[PDB]
Design a protein around this nucleic acid. Structure first.
Ligand SMILES: NC(=[NH2+])NCCC[C@H](NC(=O)[C@@H]1CCCN1C(=O)[C@H](N)Cc1ccccc1)[C@H](O)CCl
Ligand SMILES: [K+]
Lengths: 28, 249
DNA sequence: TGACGTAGGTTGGTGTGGTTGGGGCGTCA
């Protein structure tokens, strides 16, 4: 809960899953 | 999940598998929100119209999984249930209003690279991201089309849809505790969730702080990936106070 | 042809099923 939403294999190691930018881009 | 694709390992570590004990059978998706709590769709447990009225010892929960079927040893963790908690205003007679449920685990789970909890949104966070056209992400082991089931976990990304458009896309008495999402026929993209995906999470990444928050629970639809139909997800935030109350207990 | 014997993976091992698939490959009967 203190460390929620940060995935060990992505946020924590500073990697993008291969469709997350799909999502971010959608914010226009 | 229709018009999705294989999920990358550890890409959804809050994904939980809801699992019937006899016949051993995957039932539904679910989501890890702490070490000792899991969130799923009420109808995964209680649906009189199909005679479903499962209880605690009827089920188990499987966390950290990827393969739909095999026992992923020293990866997945399995938990039994202490308590099931259904929303008291949960409506199975008409429309699945407040299709939401909590399961407390007999023993809290250890987080790992494949097992981690999701955030729940604020007023602030829900206010800004739960807006039409903005995209989220549905994951589940559910069916791949309406008329077969996938070997590994599926992911798809879907745009939220304008409240009016959801209302005009169906007959079911829609409420404020539901939102719809999916593409339109103009847009020439596809995607939807399906039978078996219930309980799993519609999540969104915050561009402010980089975390994943669970905005929806997979609740219902009309067929799967149908033209001019939209998936329906329980509105999580709207029911956050119930959640919060049950956990503090 | 086929089965022994043998080797990681998102993970062990007097392991090759197990509450779970099927590895890749050369020998050999
Ligand atoms: N995204 C979609 N196109 N569909 C998602 C369906 C998710 C599944 N939910 C269901 O199958 C729900 C529960 C009862 C009938 N149902 C349905 O989706 C019905 N087709 C629509 C409905 C809604 C309300 C009341 C009656 C009937 C879960 O796996 C259980
Ligand atoms: K093995």
């Amino acid at each position: 809960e203190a460390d929620c939403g940060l995935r060990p294999l992505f946020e924590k190691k500073s990697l993008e899953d291969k469709t997350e930018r799909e999502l971010l881009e959608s914010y226009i | 999940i229709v018009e999705g694709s294989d999920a990358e390992i550890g890409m959804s570590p809050w994904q939980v598998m809801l699992f019937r004990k006899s016949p051993q059978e995957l039932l539904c998706g679910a989501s890890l929100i702490s070490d000792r709590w899991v969130l799923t769709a009420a109808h995964c447990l209680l649906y009189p119209p199909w005679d479903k009225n499962f209880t605690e010892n009827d089920l188990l929960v499987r966390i950290g999984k990827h393969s739909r079927t095999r026992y992923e040893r020293n990866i997945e963790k399995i938990s039994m249930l202490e308590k099931i908690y259904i929303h008291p205003r949960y409506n199975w007679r008409e429309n699945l209003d407040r299709d939401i449920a909590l399961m407390k685990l007999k023993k809290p789970v250890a987080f790992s690279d494949y097992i981690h909890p999701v955030c729940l949104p604020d007023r602030e966070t829900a206010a800004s991201l739960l807006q039409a056209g903005y995209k989220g992400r549905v994951t589940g082991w559910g069916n791949l089309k309406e008329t077969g089931q996938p070997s590994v976990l599926q992911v798809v990304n879907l745009p939220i849809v304008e409240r009016p458009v959801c209302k005009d896309s169906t007959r079911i008495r829609i409420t404020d505790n539901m939102f719809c999402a999916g593409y339109k026929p103009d847009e020439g993209k596809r995607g939807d969730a399906c039978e078996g995906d219930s309980g799993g999470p519609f999540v969104m990444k915050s561009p402010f702080n980089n975390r994943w928050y669970q905005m929806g629970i997979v609740s219902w639809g009309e067929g799967c990936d149908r033209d001019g139909k939209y998936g329906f997800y329980t509105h999580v935030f709207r029911l956050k106070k119930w959640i919060q109350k049950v956990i503090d207990q």
